[PDB]
Amino acid sequence: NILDFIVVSGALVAFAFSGSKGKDINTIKSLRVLRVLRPLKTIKRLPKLKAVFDCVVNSLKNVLNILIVYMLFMFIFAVIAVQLFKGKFFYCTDESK
Amino acid sequence: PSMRPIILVGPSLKGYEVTDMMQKALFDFLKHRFDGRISITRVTADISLAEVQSEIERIFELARTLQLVALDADTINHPAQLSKTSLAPIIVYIKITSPKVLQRLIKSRGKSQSKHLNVQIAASEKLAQCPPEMFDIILDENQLEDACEHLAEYLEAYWKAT
Amino acid sequence: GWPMVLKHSVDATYEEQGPSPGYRMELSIFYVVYFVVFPFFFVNIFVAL
Amino acid sequence: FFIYAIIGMQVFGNIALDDDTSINRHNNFRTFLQALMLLFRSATGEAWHEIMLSCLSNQACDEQANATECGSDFAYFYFVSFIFLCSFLMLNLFVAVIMDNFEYLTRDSSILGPHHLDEFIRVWANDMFEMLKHMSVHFTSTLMALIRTALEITKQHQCDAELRKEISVVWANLPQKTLDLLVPPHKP
Amino acid sequence: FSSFYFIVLTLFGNYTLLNVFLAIAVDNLANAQELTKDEEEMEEAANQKLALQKAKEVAARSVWEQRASQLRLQNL
Amino acid sequence: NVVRKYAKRITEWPPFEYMILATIIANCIVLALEQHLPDGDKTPMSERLDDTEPYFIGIFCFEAGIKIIALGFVFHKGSYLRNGWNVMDFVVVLTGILATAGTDFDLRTLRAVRVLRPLKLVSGIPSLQVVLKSIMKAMVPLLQIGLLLFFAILMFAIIGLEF
Amino acid sequence: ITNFDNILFAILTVFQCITMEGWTDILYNTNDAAGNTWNWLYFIPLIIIGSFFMLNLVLGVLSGEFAKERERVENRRAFLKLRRQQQIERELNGYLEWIFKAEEVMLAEEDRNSYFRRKEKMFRFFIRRMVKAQSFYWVVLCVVALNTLCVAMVHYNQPRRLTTTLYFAEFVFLGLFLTEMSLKMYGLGPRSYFRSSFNCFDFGVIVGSVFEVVWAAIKPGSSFGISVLRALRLLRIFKVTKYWSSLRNLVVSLLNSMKSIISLLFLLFLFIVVFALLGMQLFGGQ
Ligand SMILES: CC(C)CCC[C@@H](C)[C@H]1CC[C@H]2[C@@H]3CC=C4C[C@@H](OC(=O)CCC(=O)O)CC[C@]4(C)[C@H]3CC[C@]12C
Ligand SMILES: CCCCCCCCCCCCCCCC
Ligand SMILES: CCCCCCCCCCCCCCCC
Ligand SMILES: CCCCCCCCCCCCCCCC
Ligand SMILES: CCCCCCCCCCCCCCCC
Ligand SMILES: CCCCCCCCCCCCCCCC
Ligand SMILES: CCCCCCCCCCCCCCCC
Ligand SMILES: CCCCCCCCCCCCCCCC
Ligand SMILES: [Ca+2]
């Protein structure tokens, strides 16, 4: 219901800001892109699509314990890499300088 | 007696630091948990063969006050060793169900008794073949707190009974 | 595009300097350990879970 | 794929095609089909980081589009989250397919299954002795008897009682007596 | 005809690699799953027996795992 | 004959096996120490690496001789050439011997088999043998997947020819 | 080389598309030679059937083989032996805590009535009870977490006040962790300190950090990045969570079969070496 409300609210605010003045294009375009959640409505309607979504979420929660370990390990490797190659990835278009 | 006295037995031979310390920790908990309700004494005369008889009447006059009496015996390593005498304490069994943890524990407990491991394990096993009904209370817990609360709850049941 | 990153990593002289081919060539062991851990081990860990 | 294609169209749709970049005549966002092909390309891991770097902020914008600055730094989240989500969902599809088949994948030749049923259908063409040599009220009672001999649930009366219990449990959809009629043939 | 080196190295190196690392992951993760399962089952079993004896004196599963049990029974 | 067949069974005393191991790692390091230059050029140290070969081929031949005289050849149903790993060692040592024939076509393809010498590490450590059998046991069911992949490649290659 | 001019060329390019390497360049070439309307029907089905479907079949067959092999007689025997070892160690730890409490109450009783022996032993027991208390757990995790914040904010061209701050904070944290190791080892005793593999990890990491400090004192330029591995002690937050058993038993299985893993990463090394020497034979210097 929150998703439905935010979709509707985005559409209405996008309509309201239609002043044809060009004051803000980034905001109105973002409110347009917010429409893309529109097909995401049919997953609450179809029970079997919702069942598939729940199975995917269950698998994600099943691997949530190792995902934390994974992001901790990759943070450690990222920090080691920063200690190694920080500032060294500079170059010239002229190989001689 | 008016009350059945408390007797600890089951890990291994008394007088050895393993059984002595396990029983002493349980005994200290039983002491300072029930402050003003249990009597503490150390017994060094062989009740199982009943100077020998000089202390049984001492047990009665502690057991005659409707209070729990703790028996720190130094020669009981068997429940049936006392079965012939009419003293009849509660045979509390501090049981450990696997001899391998016993052996690794004897290794862990210092250096002196490492050479006394074999006979102590043998007598512990000897007590292990004894049937459970010979004992009053079974202490199968590995944690100190769980075994302590089990024994304390049965003691509360006995207290409410008498 | 990991071989390109490996080439940049090995060919890195110092802070605020340009490359030098074949420099610091022992910095491939950072990219051999990383593939052993994340692409090879952890990926298959998730697939098994 | 639909959600991500539409977001790509509506955000990175007006980047000026340049054959020296990764937004080309071949790999643009300008139509639903081209965007969907781009996402399929990224799913299989074809220089998707190059597409990200060519979809970043401050790119040359298409001549026939009104806007002057096109592309956005939303590309980092867009592409990283697409790789993560696509890989995860395809992993879940793979695992669902695998576990829908797990009794086949872990099959044993000695233990029976649909293969024995199909081969007994082939036996239709006495020959039962030959197949007993070759093994691991006309063609249904025999099937029940062979299944009983393969897997085991007076002991014969106990097996009949178990068959009756199972038939009662799994009574067919709108059948008068389908498994019940087999029970008279499955009893002996 | 020098491309057989690369065909062989990319066939026998993207599936042997997968075989080895997936075997490691599957074996170790299944061992972990069974260890936690068994220790929990033993925990409630011991707790129930302890409650029964103490009161006496004072008076689903995944497809992998069900299939593992079936294989255990069959091999037994 | 047979009076000596009894003695070289005792020769496999474990330091002998570890010495064969040592020469295998030595040969692996010698192989890894080579460098290749385009048009017949060669490094000043590659000559020394080329001179160190006869010691290795001699040690391998001596080991093969011990294993061939202490054990059988093919006859007793248990022997050298009836072990899967001993066949690879025989191929390596025999081909190294044959590479010293002084001909033209040998060097390009008879020097290449010399890369199978690291596999003598597996051939000499039975734990690595059992681990290798464990690896390869789970890739026999992949033969049908290989046939399927080849069939798909054939169909799509025929379509690609057509179009 | 990537053309369909022949059955063998077609087989080679189809096989290259199967591996999903350069399969678009081959597609983008047929979009120029011919129209781009119908070419996707050759490649998208090809990719789906050769790379996605075949990977699915390989995963299924491999997982089925793993499930079948795992429940054999000898593998089941090994797993039950591992389970027995775990149970025995758990019970032994419980009984050791029993005996330690006995030691504590006894020593208190004899002190209630060689003097420096008693002093040092009660000090040891006080430390050993402190290093296991829940507050020591939280203070050590707070120090570890405050350490990773000091290494996650090292970036290129950082202010010079930050560089010296982190340089001295590294020494402060090394001193704090050395103090923590000293207290823990004196309390539990060295024979028992190395009973937990994670303490072996911490000891090795701080030794490596000291080595890195020395090596940077000698040659300032290089940095081995071993002082960062102290972030792995943040991984104990799972202790106060219902998911300790799963991760702990995963590590137990890994460390138990750490010999069958090293002898797997070695056979891979041997095969990579064989293919390297073969490639040196074939394409060496050309
Ligand atoms: C605290 C523990 C649990 C680890 C969590 C790590 C992150 C949540 C925090 C730790 C400190 C933060 C960093 C501190 C300062 C930097 C440098 C900063 O770069 C700049 O200020 C601009 C560069 C310039 O203009 O010179 C960019 C963000 C970043 C990486 C921050 C990113 C987020 C960080 C890594
Ligand atoms: C001049 C010395 C540079 C060292 C280069 C080392 C390269 C390592 C490549 C991969 C070797 C180990 C792979 C084994 C993975 C199972
Ligand atoms: C020659 C100095 C630098 C050496 C290059 C590699 C340094 C890092 C090696 C691996 C460190 C991380 C180990 C994995 C544990 C998370
Ligand atoms: C014109 C765009 C310039 C940069 C502004 C956007 C910065 C990044 C935004 C990322 C939003 C991700 C979260 C939204 C969906 C959960
Ligand atoms: C180069 C200038 C800085 C641009 C920063 C813009 C915001 C970046 C958004 C990053 C979103 C995080 C991706 C995590 C995906 C799971
Ligand atoms: C940057 C593009 C974002 C696209 C979003 C796709 C996934 C969004 C989350 C799924 C919807 C969750 C709603 C709550 C359901 C319990
Ligand atoms: C100047 C030589 C021209 C001909 C070269 C053709 C290639 C040589 C054969 C390569 C075959 C590699 C076999 C690898 C098997 C694992
Ligand atoms: C005028 C035709 C130009 C080239 C068109 C190529 C289309 C290829 C035919 C379709 C291949 C289907 C694969 C079979 C499995 C789905
Ligand atoms: Ca690629």
Short mmCIF file of C-alpha atoms in Angstrom, two decimals, chain G residues 9-193:
data_model
loop_
_atom_site.label_atom_id
_atom_site.label_comp_id
_atom_site.label_asym_id
_atom_site.label_seq_id
_atom_site.Cartn_x
_atom_site.Cartn_y
_atom_site.Cartn_z
CA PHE G 9 35.21 -21.78 -37.99
CA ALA G 10 31.51 -21.91 -37.15
CA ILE G 11 32.15 -24.44 -34.38
CA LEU G 12 34.95 -22.29 -32.96
CA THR G 13 32.93 -19.06 -32.92
CA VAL G 14 29.87 -20.82 -31.51
CA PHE G 15 32.03 -22.29 -28.75
CA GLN G 16 33.45 -18.83 -28.06
CA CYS G 17 29.92 -17.42 -27.80
CA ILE G 18 29.02 -20.26 -25.41
CA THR G 19 31.68 -19.08 -22.95
CA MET G 20 30.03 -15.61 -23.11
CA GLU G 21 33.37 -14.08 -24.14
CA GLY G 22 33.07 -11.65 -27.03
CA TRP G 23 29.64 -12.95 -27.98
CA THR G 24 28.36 -9.43 -28.62
CA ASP G 25 31.17 -8.41 -30.97
CA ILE G 26 30.19 -11.41 -33.09
CA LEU G 27 26.58 -10.25 -32.84
CA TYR G 28 27.43 -6.63 -33.59
CA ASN G 29 29.26 -7.89 -36.68
CA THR G 30 26.17 -9.61 -38.03
CA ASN G 31 24.26 -6.39 -37.33
CA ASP G 32 26.51 -4.61 -39.84
CA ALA G 33 26.86 -7.31 -42.50
CA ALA G 34 23.08 -7.85 -42.51
CA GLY G 35 20.18 -6.11 -40.83
CA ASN G 36 19.87 -6.01 -37.06
CA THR G 37 16.22 -7.10 -36.97
CA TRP G 38 16.65 -10.88 -36.93
CA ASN G 39 20.14 -11.54 -35.56
CA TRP G 40 19.18 -11.58 -31.87
CA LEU G 41 17.17 -14.77 -32.49
CA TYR G 42 20.42 -16.58 -33.21
CA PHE G 43 22.45 -15.34 -30.26
CA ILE G 44 20.05 -14.82 -27.36
CA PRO G 45 18.73 -18.41 -27.69
CA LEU G 46 22.34 -19.53 -28.16
CA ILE G 47 23.41 -17.80 -24.94
CA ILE G 48 20.39 -19.10 -23.00
CA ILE G 49 20.83 -22.69 -24.19
CA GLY G 50 24.61 -22.90 -24.04
CA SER G 51 25.64 -20.77 -21.08
CA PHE G 52 22.58 -20.50 -18.81
CA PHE G 53 20.90 -23.86 -19.40
CA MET G 54 24.18 -25.79 -19.43
CA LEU G 55 25.39 -24.12 -16.24
CA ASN G 56 22.07 -25.10 -14.68
CA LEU G 57 22.57 -28.72 -15.72
CA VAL G 58 26.16 -28.75 -14.45
CA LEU G 59 25.14 -27.32 -11.08
CA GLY G 60 22.30 -29.83 -10.80
CA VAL G 61 24.44 -32.84 -11.69
CA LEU G 62 27.27 -31.74 -9.41
CA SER G 63 24.97 -31.09 -6.45
CA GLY G 64 23.28 -34.45 -6.97
CA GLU G 65 26.66 -36.19 -7.01
CA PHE G 66 27.69 -34.32 -3.86
CA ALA G 67 24.49 -35.35 -2.08
CA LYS G 68 24.93 -38.98 -3.17
CA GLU G 69 28.60 -39.16 -2.17
CA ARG G 70 28.14 -37.35 1.15
CA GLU G 71 25.82 -40.04 2.54
CA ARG G 72 28.13 -43.02 2.08
CA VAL G 73 29.45 -45.23 4.86
CA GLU G 74 32.92 -43.72 5.29
CA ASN G 75 31.84 -40.09 4.88
CA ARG G 76 29.06 -40.64 7.42
CA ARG G 77 31.58 -42.27 9.76
CA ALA G 78 33.90 -39.27 9.49
CA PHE G 79 31.07 -36.81 10.11
CA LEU G 80 29.88 -38.72 13.18
CA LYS G 81 33.44 -38.77 14.51
CA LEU G 82 33.58 -34.99 14.09
CA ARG G 83 30.24 -34.62 15.88
CA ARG G 84 31.48 -36.81 18.73
CA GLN G 85 34.61 -34.68 19.06
CA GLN G 86 32.51 -31.51 19.24
CA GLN G 87 30.23 -32.95 21.93
CA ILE G 88 33.18 -34.20 23.99
CA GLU G 89 34.92 -30.82 23.81
CA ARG G 90 31.74 -29.00 24.88
CA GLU G 91 31.22 -31.25 27.90
CA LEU G 92 34.89 -30.95 28.84
CA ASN G 93 34.65 -27.16 28.73
CA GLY G 94 31.66 -27.26 31.08
CA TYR G 95 33.47 -29.50 33.55
CA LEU G 96 36.58 -27.32 33.36
CA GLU G 97 34.47 -24.31 34.34
CA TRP G 98 33.14 -26.38 37.25
CA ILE G 99 36.67 -27.12 38.45
CA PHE G 100 37.75 -23.50 37.99
CA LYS G 101 34.92 -22.30 40.24
CA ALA G 102 36.02 -24.92 42.76
CA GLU G 103 39.58 -23.56 42.58
CA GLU G 104 38.31 -20.02 43.12
CA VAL G 105 36.21 -20.79 46.20
CA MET G 106 38.98 -22.94 47.68
CA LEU G 107 41.71 -20.33 47.20
CA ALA G 108 39.40 -17.72 48.73
CA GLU G 109 38.98 -20.00 51.75
CA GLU G 110 42.72 -20.53 52.29
CA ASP G 111 43.26 -16.78 51.94
CA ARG G 112 40.53 -16.22 54.54
CA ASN G 113 43.06 -17.43 57.13
CA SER G 114 54.17 -18.31 49.90
CA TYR G 115 52.10 -15.20 50.59
CA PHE G 116 53.07 -13.72 47.23
CA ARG G 117 52.06 -17.03 45.63
CA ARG G 118 48.55 -16.59 47.04
CA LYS G 119 48.51 -12.92 45.99
CA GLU G 120 49.53 -13.69 42.41
CA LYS G 121 47.11 -16.61 42.14
CA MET G 122 44.11 -14.59 43.32
CA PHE G 123 45.17 -11.82 40.94
CA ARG G 124 45.25 -14.42 38.15
CA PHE G 125 41.77 -15.63 39.06
CA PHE G 126 40.42 -12.07 39.17
CA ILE G 127 41.86 -11.41 35.71
CA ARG G 128 40.52 -14.70 34.33
CA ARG G 129 37.06 -13.81 35.63
CA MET G 130 37.41 -10.32 34.16
CA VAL G 131 38.51 -11.35 30.66
CA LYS G 132 35.44 -13.60 30.34
CA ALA G 133 32.92 -11.07 31.70
CA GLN G 134 30.47 -9.64 29.18
CA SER G 135 31.78 -6.08 29.67
CA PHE G 136 35.26 -7.06 28.46
CA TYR G 137 33.64 -8.49 25.32
CA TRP G 138 31.89 -5.19 24.62
CA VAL G 139 34.90 -2.98 25.40
CA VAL G 140 37.13 -5.05 23.10
CA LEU G 141 34.54 -4.91 20.31
CA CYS G 142 34.28 -1.15 20.79
CA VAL G 143 38.05 -0.80 20.48
CA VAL G 144 38.08 -3.01 17.37
CA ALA G 145 35.23 -1.04 15.78
CA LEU G 146 36.96 2.26 16.56
CA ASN G 147 40.04 0.77 14.90
CA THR G 148 38.33 0.00 11.58
CA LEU G 149 36.98 3.55 11.45
CA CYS G 150 40.59 4.78 11.60
CA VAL G 151 41.60 2.62 8.63
CA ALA G 152 38.47 3.06 6.50
CA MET G 153 39.07 6.81 6.23
CA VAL G 154 42.59 6.65 4.78
CA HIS G 155 42.18 8.18 1.33
CA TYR G 156 44.39 9.81 -1.28
CA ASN G 157 45.46 13.39 -0.52
CA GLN G 158 44.13 13.31 3.03
CA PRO G 159 44.91 16.27 5.31
CA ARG G 160 48.27 16.10 7.03
CA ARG G 161 46.63 16.44 10.44
CA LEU G 162 44.80 13.19 9.66
CA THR G 163 47.93 11.30 8.60
CA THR G 164 49.77 11.96 11.87
CA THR G 165 46.59 11.30 13.86
CA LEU G 166 46.21 7.85 12.32
CA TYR G 167 49.96 7.22 12.57
CA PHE G 168 49.80 7.70 16.34
CA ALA G 169 46.43 5.96 16.63
CA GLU G 170 48.01 2.86 15.09
CA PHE G 171 50.54 2.78 17.93
CA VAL G 172 47.81 3.40 20.51
CA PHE G 173 45.70 0.55 19.13
CA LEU G 174 48.68 -1.79 18.91
CA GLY G 175 49.47 -1.06 22.55
CA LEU G 176 45.86 -1.62 23.58
CA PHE G 177 45.62 -4.94 21.74
CA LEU G 178 48.97 -6.09 23.13
CA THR G 179 47.69 -5.27 26.61
CA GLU G 180 44.50 -7.21 25.88
CA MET G 181 46.49 -10.23 24.70
CA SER G 182 48.74 -10.05 27.77
CA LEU G 183 45.81 -9.94 30.19
CA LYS G 184 43.96 -12.72 28.36
CA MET G 185 47.01 -14.99 28.14
CA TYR G 186 48.01 -14.48 31.77
CA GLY G 187 44.44 -15.12 32.93
CA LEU G 188 43.61 -18.18 30.84
CA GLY G 189 47.15 -19.53 30.66
CA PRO G 190 49.07 -19.96 27.40
CA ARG G 191 48.12 -23.64 27.05
CA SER G 192 44.45 -22.62 27.14
CA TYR G 193 44.82 -19.32 25.25
#
